[PDB]
């Protein structure tokens, strides 16, 4: 709801709309970026990009820590098996 | 009792063990339903006369 | 038309909703004490944003207070003892719904409805972070209560009415270009 | 046993992510005041 | 791998938004439990010493009935040994080879 806001709430660039991200796009470019996946449309402004960023950046860390913390859980449970 | 520790190892959801003489362990081991097991060597040595 | 009765009724719901969070003491349901010898029982109480309430025991409806002051962790006990940012949710979902209101005064000036969305949108930010440092701060069991899902959920119905609100901007500025 | 990450654990990633989206929206609002402050 | 054309409508985007939490999980179970093979496989230790035989009771021990290999062990007062005694006294099949 951020990406979109900043990409559309402008009036000066309305030149057809400046770019794709629309609320529609937006939850989608969004659900797309969490999920590591493939692409659709890029920001290409800079508010739009700094968002873009942060987001790419929160995903890393979690989806990290996810796989990482698996592995603890994985790893702990197959070790325990009871002296 | 003993009986009181047996019952509280079946109801404690896997939560609690108990430390007894080894020839009732492998007595109840044996006994439906089935639910108990032994485990370790024995921590010391005796006999009944 | 319709679609701002849908912003109106929208606004007023999620400014409703979180009113009702914060002043409620229903966020935590945990198990402690409620009142201030040498001897204790912890019985299960409905833990809020400022008082302790048992719901169980002889000591069911006391409300104790809560003394969240027993740096990065002073900050954290002092952002959270004061509520900053959950009562900044409901400062900016009211301010929100004035400019909504002083539209239907002052329509020729298109500003009114993105300030609007403006702050319905950081109001759902406040009210994320006030999730986040009320979750961080509070850490045997707990299960969150229904005034802290009326503050999730306000979250939820603040963030579409932003949305509702900048398409009301964008379209009557569309508008516009169309009569040019 | 392991236990299950927290949200104490994984904490400066949402203010991050939180003070970012302020902050481009700050940087979008400034360029639209500054454009509409040229008309 | 792969990023070339992605849905459009929304009966589309559903069936891929799905599809990618499906692959986040298997992509990171695959991962996360490969890791666990390679390390716990790798912490494990070689047999080493009379305690850890003592702690184990996968692989059996056995000395010789008429010997000094089995007095040793049933005269034994140290517990590290005192314990394997009293299995292999008991223990069935007869570890006790001829």
Not at chain 3, 144 to 166: D, H, K, T
């Amino acid at each position: 709801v951020v990406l979109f806001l900043v990409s559309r709430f402008s009036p000066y660039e309305w030149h057809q709309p400046p770019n794709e991200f629309g609320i529609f796009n937006s939850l989608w470019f969004s659900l797309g970026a969490f999920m590591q996946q493939g692409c659709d449309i890029s920001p290409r402004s800079l508010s739009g990009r700094i968002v873009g960023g942060v987001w790419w950046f929160f995903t890393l860390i979690i989806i990290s820590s996810y796989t990482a913390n698996l592995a603890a859980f994985l790893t702990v449970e197959r070790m325990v098996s009871p002296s | 009792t003993t009986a009181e520790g047996v019952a509280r190892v079946r109801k404690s959801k896997g939560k609690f063990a108990f430390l007894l003489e080894s020839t009732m362990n492998e007595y109840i081991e044996q006994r439906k339903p089935c639910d108990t097991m032994k485990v370790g060597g024995n921590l010391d040595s005796k006999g009944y006369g | 038309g319709v679609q701002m009765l849908l912003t109106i009724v929208g606004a007023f719901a999620a400014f409703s909703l979180m009113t009702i969070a914060v002043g409620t003491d229903y966020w935590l349901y945990s198990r402690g004490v409620c009142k201030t010898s040498k001897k204790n029982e912890e019985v299960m109480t409905h833990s809020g944003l400022w008082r302790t309430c048992c719901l169980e025991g002889n000591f069911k409806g006391l409300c104790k207070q809560i003394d969240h002051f027993p740096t990065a962790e002073y900050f954290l006990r002092a952002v959270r003892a004061s509520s900053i940012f959950p009562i900044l949710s409901v400062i900016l979902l009211f301010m929100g719904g004035l400019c909504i209101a002083a539209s239907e005064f002052y329509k020729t000036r298109h500003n009114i409805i993105l300030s609007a969305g403006i702050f319905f949108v950081s109001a759902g930010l406040s009210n994320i972070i006030g999730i986040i440092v009320y979750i961080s701060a509070n850490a045997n069991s707990y299960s969150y209560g229904w005034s802290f899902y009326f503050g999730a959920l306000s979250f939820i119905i603040a963030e579409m009415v932003g949305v509702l609100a900048v398409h009301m901007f964008i379209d009557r500025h569309k508008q516009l270009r169309a009569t040019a | 046993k392991t236990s299950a990450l927290s949200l104490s654990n994984v904490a400066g990633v949402f203010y991050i992510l939180v003070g970012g989206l302020g902050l481009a929206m700050l940087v979008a609002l400034i360029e639209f005041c500054y454009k509409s402050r040229a008309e | 791998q792969g990023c070339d054309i992605s849905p459009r409508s929304l009966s589309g985007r559903i069936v891929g938004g799905v599809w990618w939490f499906f692959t986040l999980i298997i992509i990171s179970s695959y991962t996360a439990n490969l890791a666990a093979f390679l390390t716990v496989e790798r912490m494990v230790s070689p047999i080493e010493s009379a305690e850890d035989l003592a702690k184990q009771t996968e692989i059996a021990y056995g000395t010789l009935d008429s010997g000094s290999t089995k007095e040793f062990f049933r005269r034994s007062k140290i517990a590290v040994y005192e314990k394997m005694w009293t299995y292999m006294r008991s223990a069935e099949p007869s570890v006790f080879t001829r």
